[PDB]
Symmetry: D3
Subunit: 143 residues, 6 copies
């Protein structure tokens, strides 16, 4: 049966989002355990984080094998070239819309240190977009 | 000013979600570059993934320093103990509600291989919850 | 002392093969532990794998010190330039002969998906050979 | 798929796995020489190509397992986690009870006492690994 | 040949300090490159850092082979048991004397947040000392 | 905060950084001995405690930078990415033009020719590092 347009397609997407966050959160928590001298706690958080990597990648396998799109971009991710095109689309959204819009709202609401951070991130994602565009030109057979 | 109840609080949350997904996606794409013999593409994806780690952790710093909750659980993450309690709450949600509910829907919709995966993940998150509960008992001064 | 023609020369080569396989096997097994929710088991597999890295590298130390060749390629691996030349030799054998031959036999025996995997790898090792060839100019 | 047992393709998957396993170890060993001598581009290329050879080795193991073939190193099944630990125990046991003590005896007879001492250190290490894996297996079977 | 009392003994110790600092510095700098969107710069910092690891480890090889002590603790580091005893010695000096003394001076000079950081580290190194003490029984 | 320049606390942050830097290197070196001998629990403890000493070193650098102090290794500022690369160039330059060639001359005079050859290999490596960092700095300033 086709996964397109099913509740299961949406559930694979939401599963991916949650697993992605769990890995990031557990590695961030491990640095607090590190500073305070809890190596066994830090090691458990890092080992469980590898479990959450495996879960995230398995969600993406069912997504890709089912012909579903990338949770982050709604672009196909069947081939390497499509994977780089998904990277470019996400970076482009972040520097041309998401982070400048967040920075404007942070300045309006009275949070200039947060706005400066969002402005730093917009410049970073613009750089990432350009580096991925240069890879895509080489994959397609150019300089 | 207090970040609680602001558009900027919500934007930090959404920024964290996107950065988490970007790191997972780029490491997954790097394994396709690896198999096909593109070490420079794989290396770029892994180096840009470190950038997305830095971005995710900086969002969590502004969240924690502002007294906002964990994007994944809506629990506080100021202290190590609160961080482990956030881990336990997320694992508990996944094995007692999220993954069993996804498995039931996958079976109803005619996707038994996806349901078996969700059932495997529910058993994994139950194990993770128990391991974190054992750490929390030790942090609080017990065996 | 010179290891040429001894049983110990062959035993170091077989030791290197087994230690290389053990690291790869234990990291593969760790991913199964990861998905199923066994973080202590996965962490032990990963720490024991570091032991098998140390074992493999020490066999290569004795091979090089005893004037023996690279177990994979039968080329000398004394200097960094020699090491990159051994890498190029192995990659060239794999893309020009080994993987295409594996793919032909897999097609003949009725394993079409395994044949396509061998063809993907033949293309990959050609790419690896190119990248190594383009750094030789740094080593003279 | 057809059964792989007894075919030349079965033998080729095993030899492929051996060569890929050696390539990763060789390239990481070479990278440490490039590190000490001041060639960071070459070192990073060796490390990225080594990730390629990991992907290749793991893909060979995927086909081996999916076609009901045994572990190239031990001739034991590797379908379940318990079977994977039993294969680790069988390999460690062969190494400390037969392979390394036999190698050490021959090294001493042939006039290589420092190589014999190395093989004796390795036999003690694999004995220790075997005991640690046997303790894990007991925990797995006990729930 | 015995390095005791030579200028080369002291030079190996200063080499080890500088190489240790260089690895930490370059990985810290890499995180700034990461946040700002410079993946080529971050990757070069990380690869050069691997070079400084190889340099530090080779200085420790010559220190141990020449019968010298651990640069950090002045304890021998020949055997694994000695290595864990050196770790315990350093951790014990840091929690019983060094970090509490740093915290007292920081309070005296008017740096309250830096004092609290030194106190967090004194507690951390006490924990490290305990964990190492509890593995000694494995080494006899 | 008060200015840190010229205080004992400034000197203590520098010595703290030196000790933390050595602890990480020492513990990773010890872990390789535990690896070869068959002590994976001890090896993993050394590796996890080493992550603790990374967190400690980086926190010392945070206070150093935030209080306008210079890099402990070079006495150069490390506030911006460009300053961080200039500090890397100054340290590499000192090492290949003064420190390692002087060490090599003394080793040869004192009868340690293999130690002298090592110091000469290191001088060539740091020369190579200095050139690679100078190329990065040129790219940074040029946009
Ligand atoms: Cl702990
Ligand atoms: Cl490439
Ligand atoms: Cl477990
Ligand atoms: Cl290079
Ligand atoms: Cl860059
Ligand atoms: Cl152990
Ligand atoms: Fe999970
Ligand atoms: Fe990005
Ligand atoms: Fe980002
Ligand atoms: Fe979990
Ligand atoms: Fe081994
Ligand atoms: Fe290759
Ligand atoms: Fe390969
Ligand atoms: Fe073993
Ligand atoms: Fe160095
Ligand atoms: Fe410590
Ligand atoms: Fe410390
Ligand atoms: Fe350097």
């Amino acid at each position: 049966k086709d996964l397109k347009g099913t509740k299961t397609a949406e559930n694979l997407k939401q599963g991916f989002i949650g697993e992605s966050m769990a890995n990031r959160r557990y590695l961030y928590f491990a640095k607090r355990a590190d500073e305070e001298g809890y190596p066994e706690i830090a090691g458990l958080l890092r080992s469980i984080a590898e479990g959450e990597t495996a879960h995230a990648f398995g969600h993406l396998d069912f997504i890709r094998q089912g012909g579903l799109t990338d949770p982050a971009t709604d672009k196909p991710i069947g081939t390497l070239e499509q994977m780089i095109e998904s990277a470019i689309a996400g970076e482009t959204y972040e520097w041309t819309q998401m982070y400048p819009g967040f920075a404007k709202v942070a300045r309006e609401e009275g949070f200039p240190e947060v706005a400066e951070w969002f402005e730093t991130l917009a410049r970073a994602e613009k750089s990432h977009a350009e580096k991925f565009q240069n890879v895509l030109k080489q994959l397609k057979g150019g300089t």
